[PDB]
Write an enzyme that holds these catalytic residues in place. Structure first.
Site, PDB file in Angstrom:
ATOM      1  N   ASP A   2     -54.071 -10.535 -72.477  1.00 61.39           N
ATOM      2  CA  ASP A   2     -54.348 -11.205 -73.750  1.00 61.39           C
ATOM      3  C   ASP A   2     -54.436 -10.252 -74.938  1.00 61.39           C
ATOM      4  O   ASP A   2     -54.864 -10.671 -76.019  1.00 61.39           O
ATOM      5  CB  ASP A   2     -55.635 -12.042 -73.691  1.00 61.39           C
ATOM      6  CG  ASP A   2     -55.554 -13.168 -72.683  1.00 61.39           C
ATOM      7  OD1 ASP A   2     -54.443 -13.684 -72.450  1.00 61.39           O
ATOM      8  OD2 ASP A   2     -56.605 -13.532 -72.115  1.00 61.39           O
ATOM      9  N   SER A   3     -54.030  -8.996 -74.786  1.00 60.30           N
ATOM     10  CA  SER A   3     -54.221  -8.001 -75.828  1.00 60.30           C
ATOM     11  C   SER A   3     -53.091  -8.055 -76.852  1.00 60.30           C
ATOM     12  O   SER A   3     -51.995  -8.553 -76.585  1.00 60.30           O
ATOM     13  CB  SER A   3     -54.314  -6.600 -75.222  1.00 60.30           C
ATOM     14  OG  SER A   3     -55.394  -6.517 -74.309  1.00 60.30           O
TER      15      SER A   3
END
Ligand SMILES: [Zn+2]
Ligand SMILES: [Zn+2]
Ligand SMILES: [Zn+2]
Lengths: 67, 49, 436, 49, 116, 269, 48, 46, 49, 245
Positions: free
Chosen positions: C151-152
Site C-alpha cells: 500500500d506504499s
RNA sequence: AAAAAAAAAA
C-alpha cells in the site's frame, strides 16, 4: 488560496496564466479554448487551471489587523 | 524452495538467499515493468454477451 | 424553479404546491416509490408495478456527507467506502475561511487546496468546491524499485520542492494570571536569574518586557514562550534570613520540545475573572517526507516509502514525470475499479478541458463512452501510456496506466508520532516510565 | 397536455434543480436550528406554564 | 526533523575520497571502483563506454541504496590491460565524444540562427 | 573500443523550445543528457529572503517559497558567478549573489496585484522573464497582465523584502530547474520491440513515425541498436534552451574532468 | 439561530465581523470551546 | 518600556506600561493584538 | 431479511422472491450497480466489519 | 514499562536484508548502547567520548566501577574523561547493532524478531518486505516498536535465538513464515517464463546484485548470432548449494 | 501533577 508559480509535474510557469484564464472565461470562451489560447498544450498544466480555486479573494474581504 | 533451502543449507545461507532474490527481481522489474489498468478489467464483447 | 434564482419561487412553495411530501420511515411500508420516470413509462405487459405513489428525486442522496465525496461509489467496495468515510474526516485542507482570527489548539492549512476535477453534483452543496481538502495529482500505476509495495506510495521530490502537499500546522498555547485575594500572586514579566527560583534551562532573551513573545520570532527546541513569575509564599524563617535569596518562582509556559516554527499571532485580553489572558498561535512548516500518511478518494491509504527526484524516476514520451506512484497490487484486493474510472475521467477532462461528472447510478456516464471520447485526443483508449526508465532510459516492456486523480493527505505525520527514550522521569508511586 | 411531461435529460436537470432549491432553502444544519427554536420559543414557555 | 541536507547529494564531506579502489580476490585482474555523491548518470556513461571495448570482460555499476549517493563499478579485463586503464580510456573517449557533440551542436545553432 | 561519431538535425527552434534529432550515439548518452538538462544544469534563483513588513494575509514562508520559484534571466551571468561555498566572501559579494528589492504599499480601494515587475534588481541584466512580456505593444490578446502574480493586497497592507539570488542546479532544489519538461523518444515505430503492445491498432501514431496508415508496427529487427533519438527541450524562461544544452555539456565536462583528476590523483599509490 | 446576533446576516456583514460566510454554525460556545450536541437514538414512546 | 498594541476594531496604536488593564482608550474593546517584531530573521526560499 | 412488511425495500413489491429483491447482483462493478443492489452490497459489507 | 525503547511508523525498504532494520538518526542518537571498555577498542571509545553527544557517532555517559555517572552534555571536565579497563560507556547506536523489533498486537512467536541496525537519515523504520508476513504489517500507518539490549550477554542471546534466519520455520505448522510476495513474486512468475529472452547487458545489470556470487558467469543459452541468456539461467545463480525440487 | 470523559490510528 492562490495560483502556484510553477507546474508541479512539469515545471512550466503558471503564475501569469490565471487572471488571463479568468478574463478569457468571463467573455465568451469555454475552459478548453481558454487553455488552448494560453499555450498550455499539455494536460498536466491544464489540470492546474481547471481545478484551481482562488481563496485569497475571500481572505482579502476581511478587515486587516493594521490600518 | 525456501523450506528445503533452509533444511539443506542452514539458517544463514537461506536468509542470504531471501535477500539475494528480491534485489535482482526488483532490478529486473525496472526493465520489465508491471501494471494493471482499466483495460485489464474489460473482457471481450462476445464474452460479455 | 428557473426563476427562484431570479426572485422568489422557493422550496416551500414547491412543497405547498402539492408535488413534494415529507414521507417518514414509518410511511415507507405503505407507499410505492420508484427509481425514475423511466419505470413509470413501462408498458403494462412487462410492468413490474402499475400502482405507483411516489418517485425518488435522486438515489445518490441516500449517502451522507463524507460518503458522497467518493467519485463513482457504486464501482467500489462498501467496506472501502466506509474506510473512505472514516478517513474523509482526517483529510487536510482549508477548514474555514476566518482561520486567521480563530484560535484552535491544533490546526492545519494546505498551501494550494485543489477542487476535484472528477467530482459529483453532491459537493456543490457541501461547499467542497469553495472549501476543498485534497490535491489533484498525476499518478501512474506501476512498480518502481519495489519501494511502493504493501500500500506504499512514492512522491516526486521536484514537485514537493515546488509545493506539493506542503502545509502549515498551527498550535495554540494559553496562559492567565491570577489575582485572587487569597492566592499566590503571579505576573506576566520577563524572569530574572536572581529573582526566580527553580528556573528551567531555556533561552529567556526572546521574551519582551512583559514576558510575552512578539510575533515573527523563530522558536525551536525548549524555548520559553510565555513568561509568568509567581510570588513565593511568606516563609520568612527567623533562624536564617539569608536563605531567602529568591522571592519569586518560575511558572512559565514552554514550547513543545520536538516542534519548531515561527510565532504567528499573539493575543492578550481579559477573561471572565478579569485577569490578563494570553493566547498565542505558532505556525510550523509541514513538508511531505518519508512516512507521511496519504490517502485516495477510494480508501487507498498508505505511507510514503521513499522520495525520488525527477532525474531518477520514470518519464513518458512527453517528458511527464508523475507526482506520485502507487502499487497495482493494492488495486484488486481493495476492489477499486472506481479509482480507475476516476483516473480515466480525469485524463479525459484534463485533455478536453471540462469538469468530470462522477454521479453514481448515472446511465449517461460509461466506461466505453469515456474511452471513445479519450481516443479522439491522441491518447490510448484505455488510458495506457508508454514510459521510460529513469536510471537507464530504456522503454518499459509493460505499458502503464497514467492520469490525474484526487489524493488527500492525512494528519498522521511521522513528526507527530516518532518517539525515543533512553532514561527519563519515573513515577512517584511505582517508579515506572511515563505515559504519552 | 403532453408538453408538460419531462424528458429524460430534462428529468436529470430538473431533479438536480430541485435538489439545488432544497439545499438553497433548508441547507445542511436545518434540524439543529429548528430544534433550538422549538426549545427556545415553545418549550420554555411550556415549562414555566 | 530527520531531513538530511539537500547539498549532501553532490558534495563530499571532510576527508572523504571520491574514488576508492578495491582489489577483487575471486578472479584475476578485477577491481571495484566506489564513487560517492553522484547518481546513475556517470556510472551509466562509464559502463556504456566500457562495453564497446573488446578488451574488457566485465564492467558494471550498481547503486546499493537510493538514500546513499554512492555507486560501485566492478571491472575485470584480460591479462594484458588494466581495469583502471580501461576506465581511463572510457572517460577519455566519453570526453572526446561529447566534445564532438558540443561542437556539432554549436554548428547546428549557428546554421539554424543564420538560416532563419 | 573507440568513441562514437554522432550527428545533429535540428527541426524546430524558438525562444523557449528546441526540437532536434541525435544520430549514431548510445542510449545512455541521450538519457544522461536529459538527466543533466533537468537536474545538473545551473541557473540563478532567489535563495536568501529577508522580510521587514508582512502585513498581508499570507505567511512569511509561503511568500518566500512563492518568490523562490520565480525564474530569472541568467544566460550571461551563471557562467561567471561562483557558489557561496566557493567564495572567500561572507557577506554576499556581488560576484556571489544578486540583490533584489521590493517595497509595495497599497493605499487604493481596489486590489493591488503585486507581481514580478515590482521586484527591482541591483544587477542591470539579472531580470525576471517578464522583461520579454513588457515589450509587446501589439497586444491583441486583450490582457496586459502577462506577469507572474506574486500576491494580491488590499488597502492598508504593505510588503517590503530584500532578497539574494544564488547559483544552483535542480538536483539541490527544484527552483533551480531551467527546463519545463524534456521530451525524449527513441524508436517510435517499435521496430526493436522494447515495449510490448497487446493491441498495436489501439495506439495512436507518434509524430516522429515512419509508417503508413494501415501499418501499426514496424517489422522486428534484432540487429537494431538505439542510435536515433528525438529531443524536445522546453525552457521555463530562466535560460535559453540551447544555453541549457551548452551549460549541461559544460557540467558534463566539469564532472568527467573531476573524475579524471581524482583518478590521476589516486593512481599514484 | 433565530435569537443569535448572526441571524439573517449577509456575507459582507459576516465578513466585517470576522466570521465565515460558509460557516453553517450549529454549535454552542462554552468557555470559548465549540461544543456540538449529538442526537441520541431512543425507542418511540407510547408505542405498543 | 511602555510599548504598543493594536485594538481589535479601532486598529489603533495603543501604548501603555505593561501593568494597565487590557482596554482600548478610544472605544473600550477588550481584544488587542501585539505588533510584529522589528527583528529581522532569515527565511530560506526552498 | 424483510425489514419492511414482506419487503426488503419499498421500491419492490410485497411477497417478491425474485433475485432483484433477494439480493443477487446481476451487474459487475465495472458496469455499475443499481441503487437497490448497492444497498444490498452495503448489507453484505457491513457484516464483515 | 521499559526504559530503552522507541516506536515509529514503518516504511518498506527492499534492498535491506531481512536481518537488518533501518534506524533513524535521532533515534540512534537518543538510544544508547552501554558498551564496556576493553583494551582492544580503547582508542575508538576514547575518540567516541571525545566526540561526545554533540556529534554522531558519540556517547552520553560514562559509568565507572563505583556507579558514578559522568555526563557529556554540560561541558565535561577533561580529567573526568579517563577510560580505565572495565569501565562503562553509553555510546550511540552504530551500525551492526542487534536490537529487538516488535509489532503490536503480538499474536504468535514470529511477531518479534532480532535485527541489525543500519543507520538511515529519514525518520521512519526501514526493513525488508518479507517481514510483512510474520509481523502482519501493512505499511498503512503502522506504529511499531524497537528495543535495545542493555547487556551484551542479552545481545548474544538475541544473536543466537532471537535473530530472524534462525526463526524461519514455524513450529506451528512446519512451514516458513516469510515469503516472496507482491510484485517481487509477480516478476518471479513473469521472469521464469520460457519466452523471456534476456540480453547480455540486462543480465550484466542483474549480476552485481548477487553478493554471494562466485564471479563465474555462465555460458549463454543462445550463443549465435547474439549472446542471450534466460530467466532460469540467472535464477540458477541465485540458488546456492545442492537444491533438488 | 493525578483522575474522569471524548475523539481517533493500527
Ligand atoms: Zn506542466
Ligand atoms: Zn561570494
Ligand atoms: Zn478601539
Amino acid at each position: 488560496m492562490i495560483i502556484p508559480i510553477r507546474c508541479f509535474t512539469c515545471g512550466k510557469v503558471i503564475g501569469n496564466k490565471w487572471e488571463s484564464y479568468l478574463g478569457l472565461l468571463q467573455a465568451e470562451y469555454t475552459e478548453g479554448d481558454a487553455l488552448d489560447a494560453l499555450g498550455l498544450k499539455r494536460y498536466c498544466c491544464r489540470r492546474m487551471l481547471l481545478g484551481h480555486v482562488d481563496l485569497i479573494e475571500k481572505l482579502l474581504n476581511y478587515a486587516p489587523l493594521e490600518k | 524452495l525456501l523450506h528445503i533451502c533452509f533444511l539443506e543449507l542452514g539458517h544463514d545461507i537461506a536468509g542470504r538467499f531471501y535477500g539475494n532474490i528480491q534485489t535482482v527481481i526488483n532490478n529486473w522489474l525496472l526493465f520489465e515493468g508491471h501494471s494493471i489498468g482499466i483495460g485489464d478489467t474489460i473482457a471481450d464483447p462476445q464474452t460479455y454477451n | 424553479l428557473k426563476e427562484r434564482d431570479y426572485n422568489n419561487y422557493s422550496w416551500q412553495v414547491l412543497v405547498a404546491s402539492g408535488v413534494v411530501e415529507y414521507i417518514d420511515t414509518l410511511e415507507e411500508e405503505t407507499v410505492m416509490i420508484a427509481m425514475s420516470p423511466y419505470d413509470l413509462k413501462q408498458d403494462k405487459d412487462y410492468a413490474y408495478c402499475t400502482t405507483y405513489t411516489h418517485c425518488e428525486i435522486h438515489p445518490a442522496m441516500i449517502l451522507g456527507v463524507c460518503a458522497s465525496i467518493i467519485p463513482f461509489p457504486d464501482h467500489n467496495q462498501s467496506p472501502r467506502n466506509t474506510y473512505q468515510s472514516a478517513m474523509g474526516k482526517q483529510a487536510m485542507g482549508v477548514y474555514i475561511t476566518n482561520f486567521h482570527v480563530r484560535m484552535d489548539t491544533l490546526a492545519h492549512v494546505l498551501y494550494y487546496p485543489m477542487k476535484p476535477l472528477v467530482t459529483t453534483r453532491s459537493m456543490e452543496y457541501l461547499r467542497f468546491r469553495e472549501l476543498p481538502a485534497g490535491i489533484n495529482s498525476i499518478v501512474a500505476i506501476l512498480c518502481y524499485t519495489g519501494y511502493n509495495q504493501e500500500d506504499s506510495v512514492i512522491l516526486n521530490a521536484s514537485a514537493v520542492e515546488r509545493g506539493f502537499f506542503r502545509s502549515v500546522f498551527y498550535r495554540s498555547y494559553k496562559d492567565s494570571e491570577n489575582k485572587r485575594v487569597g492566592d499566590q500572586e503571579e505576573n506576566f514579566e520577563k524572569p530574572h536569574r536572581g529573582t526566580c527560583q527553580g528556573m528551567r534551562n531555556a533561552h529567556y532573551d526572546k521574551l519582551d518586557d512583559d514576558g510575552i513573545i512578539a510575533p515573527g520570532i523563530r522558536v525551536s527546541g525548549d524555548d520559553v514562550v510565555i513568561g509568568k513569575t509567581i510570588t513565593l509564599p511568606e516563609n520568612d524563617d527567623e533562624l536564617d534570613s539569608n536563605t531567602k535569596r529568591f522571592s519569586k518562582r518560575d511558572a512559565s509556559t514552554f514550547l513543545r520540545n520536538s516542534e519548531t516554527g515561527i510565532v504567528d499571532q499573539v493575543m492578550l485580553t481579559l477573561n471572565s475573572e478579569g485577569y490578563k489572558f494570553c493566547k498565542i498561535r505558532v505556525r510550523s512548516v509541514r513538508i511531505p517526507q518519508i512516512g507521511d500518511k496519504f490517502a485516495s478518494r477510494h480508501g487507498q491509504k498508505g505511507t510514503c516509502g521513499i522520495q525520488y527526484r525527477q532525474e531518477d524516476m520514470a518519464f513518458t514520451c512527453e517528458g511527464l514525470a508523475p507526482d506520485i506512484i502507487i502499487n497495482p497490487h493494492a488495486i484488486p484486493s481493495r476492489m477499486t475499479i472506481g479509482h480507475l474510472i476516476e483516473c480515466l475521467q480525469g485524463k479525459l477532462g484534463s485533455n478536453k478541458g471540462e469538469i468530470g461528472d462522477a454521479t453514481p447510478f448515472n446511465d449517461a456516464v460509461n466506461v466505453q463512452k469515456i474511452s471513445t471520447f479519450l481516443q479522439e485526443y491522441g491518447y490510448h483508449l484505455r488510458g495506457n501510456e508508454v514510459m521510460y526508465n529513469g536510471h537507464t532510459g530504456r522503454k518499459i516492456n509493460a505499458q502503464v496506466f497514467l492520469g490525474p486523480t484526487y489524493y488527500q493527505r492525512l494528519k498522521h505525520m511521522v513528526d507527530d508520532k516518532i518517539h525515543s527514550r533512553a532514561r527519563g522521569p519515573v513515577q512517584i508511586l511505582v517508579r515506572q516510565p511515563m505515559e504519552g | 397536455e403532453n408538453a408538460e411531461e419531462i424528458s429524460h435529460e430534462l428529468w436529470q436537470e430538473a431533479c438536480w434543480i430541485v435538489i439545488n432549491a432544497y439545499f438553497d432553502e433548508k441547507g445542511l444544519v436545518r434540524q439543529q436550528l429548528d430544534s433550538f427554536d422549538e426549545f427556545i420559543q415553545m418549550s420554555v414557555q411550556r415549562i414555566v406554564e | 526533523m530527520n531531513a538530511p541536507p539537500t547539498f549532501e547529494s553532490f558534495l563530499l564531506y571532510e576527508g572523504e575520497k571520491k574514488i576508492i579502489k578495491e582489489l577483487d580476490t575471486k578472479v584475476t585482474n578485477a577491481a571495484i571502483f566506489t564513487i560517492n555523491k553522484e547518481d546513475h548518470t556517470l556510472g551509466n556513461m562509464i559502463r556504456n563506454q566500457l562495453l564497446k571495448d573488446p578488451n574488457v570482460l566485465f564492467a558494471g555499476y550498481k547503486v546499493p541504496h537510493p538514500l546513499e549517493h554512492k555507486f560501485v563499478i566492478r571491472i575485470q579485463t584480460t591479462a594484458d590491460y588494466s581495469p583502471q586503464e580501461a576506465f581511463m580510456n572510457a572517460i577519455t573517449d566519453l570526453l572526446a565524444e561529447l566534445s564532438l557533440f558540443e561542437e556539432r551542436f554549436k554548428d547546428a545553432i549557428k546554421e539554424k540562427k543564420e538560416g532563419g | 573500443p573507440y568513441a562514437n561519431q554522432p550527428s545533429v538535425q535540428i527541426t524546430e527552434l524558438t525562444d523557449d523550445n528546441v526540437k532536434f534529432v541525435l544520430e549514431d550515439t548510445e542510449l545512455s548518452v541521450a538519457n544522461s543528457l536529459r538527466r543533466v538538462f533537468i537536474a545538473e544544469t545551473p541557473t540563478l534563483a532567489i535563495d536568501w529572503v529577508q522580510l521587514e513588513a508582512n502585513s498581508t494575509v499570507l505567511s512569511d514562508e509561503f511568500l518566500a517559497h512563492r518568490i523562490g520559484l520565480i525564474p530569472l534571466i541568467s544566460d550571461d551571468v551563471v557562467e561567471r558567478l561562483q557558489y557561496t561555498r566557493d567564495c572567500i566572501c561572507l557577506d554576499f559579494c556581488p560576484e556571489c549573489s544578486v540583490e533584489f528589492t521590493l517595497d509595495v504599499k497599497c493605499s487604493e480601494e481596489q486590489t493591488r496585484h503585486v507581481t514580478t515587475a515590482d521586484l527591482k534588481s541591483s544587477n542591470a541584466k539579472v531580470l525576471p522573464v517578464t522583461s520579454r512580456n513588457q515589450g509587446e505593444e501589439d497586444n491583441e490578446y486583450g490582457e496586459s497582465n502577462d506577469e507572474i502574480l506574486i500576491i494580491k493586497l488590499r488597502k492598508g497592507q504593505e510588503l517590503k523584502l530584500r532578497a539574494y539570488a544564488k547559483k544552483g542546479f535542480g538536483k539541490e532544489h527544484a527552483k533551480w530547474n531551467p527546463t519545463a519538461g524534456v521530451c525524449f523518444e527513441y524508436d517510435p515505430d517499435n521496430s526493436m520491440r522494447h515495449t510490448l503492445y497487446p493491441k498495436p491498432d489501439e495506439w495512436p501514431k507518434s509524430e516522429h513515425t515512419e509508417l503508413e496508415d494501415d501499418q501499426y508496427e514496424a517489422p522486428y529487427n534484432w540487429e537494431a541498436k538505439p542510435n536515433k533519438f528525438f529531443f524536445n527541450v522546453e525552457s521555463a524562461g530562466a535560460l535559453k534552451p540551447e544555453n541549457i544544452v551548452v551549460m549541461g555539456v559544460q557540467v558534463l565536462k566539469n564532472k568527467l574532468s573531476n573524475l579524471q583528476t581524482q583518478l590521476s590523483h589516486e593512481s599514484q599509490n | 439561530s433565530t435569537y443569535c446576533l448572526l441571524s439573517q446576516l449577509t456575507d459582507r456583514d459576516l465578513t466585517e465581523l470576522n466570521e465565515c460566510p460558509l460557516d453553517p454554525g450549529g454549535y454552542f460556545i462554552i468557555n470559548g470551546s465549540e461544543k456540538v450536541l449529538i442526537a441520541q437514538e431512543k425507542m418511540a414512546t407510547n408505542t405498543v | 518600556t511602555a510599548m504598543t498594541y493594536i485594538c481589535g476594531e479601532c486598529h489603533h496604536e495603543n501604548e501603555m506600561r505593561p501593568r494597565d488593564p487590557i482596554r482600548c482608550r478610544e472605544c473600550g474593546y477588550r481584544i488587542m493584538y501585539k505588533k510584529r517584531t522589528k527583528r529581522l530573521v532569515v527565511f530560506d526560499a526552498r | 431479511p424483510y425489514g419492511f412488511r414482506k419487503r426488503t425495500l419499498p421500491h419492490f413489491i410485497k411477497d417478491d422472491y425474485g433475485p432483484e429483491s433477494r439480493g443477487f447482483v446481476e451487474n459487475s462493478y465495472l458496469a455499475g450497480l443499481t441503487p437497490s443492489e448497492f444497498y444490498f452490497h452495503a448489507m453484505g459489507g457491513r457484516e464483515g466489519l | 514499562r521499559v526504559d530503552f525503547s522507541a516506536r515509529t511508523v514503518i516504511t518498506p525498504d527492499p534492498n535491506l536484508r531481512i536481518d537488518q532494520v533501518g534506524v533513524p538518526r535521532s533515534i540512534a542518537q537518543n538510544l544508547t548502547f552501554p558498551e564496556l571498555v576493553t583494551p582492544f577498542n580503547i582508542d575508538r571509545m576514547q575518540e567516541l567520548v571525545r566526540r561526545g553527544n554533540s556529534q554522531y557517532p558519540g556517547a552520553k555517559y560514562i559509568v565507572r566501577d563505583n556507579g558514578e555517572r559522568i555526563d557529556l552534555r554540560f561541558h565535561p571536565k577533561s580529567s573526568d574523561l579517563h577510560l580505565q579497563c572495565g569501565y562503562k560507556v553509553e555510546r550511540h547506536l552504530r551500525d551492526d547493532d542487534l536490537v529487538i523489533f516488535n509489532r503490536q498486537p503480538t499474536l504468535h512467536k514470529m511477531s518479534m524478531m532480532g535485527h541489525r541496525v543500519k543507520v538511515l537519515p529519514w525518520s521512519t523504520f526501514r526493513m525488508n518486505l518479507s517481514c510483512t508476513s510474520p509481523y502482519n504489517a501493512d505499511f498503512d500507518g503502522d506504529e511499531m516498536n524497537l528495543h535495545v539490549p542493555q547487556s551484551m550477554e542479552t545481545r548474544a542471546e538475541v544473536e543466537n535465538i532471537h535473530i530472524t534466519p534462525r526463526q524461519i520455520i514455524t513450529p506451528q505448522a512446519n512451514k516458513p513464515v516469510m515469503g516472496i510476495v507482491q510484485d517481487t513474486l509477480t516478476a518471479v512468475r513473469k521472469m521464469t517464463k520460457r519466452d523471456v529472452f534476456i540480453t547480455r547487458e540486462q543480465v550484466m545489470n542483474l549480476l552485481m546484485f548477487l553478493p554471494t556470487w562466485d564471479a563465474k558467469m555462465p555460458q549463454p543459452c543462445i550463443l549465435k548470432p547474439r549472446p542471450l541468456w534466460t530467466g532460469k539461467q540467472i535464477f540458477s545463480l541465485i540458488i546456492p548449494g545442492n537444491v533438488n525440487m
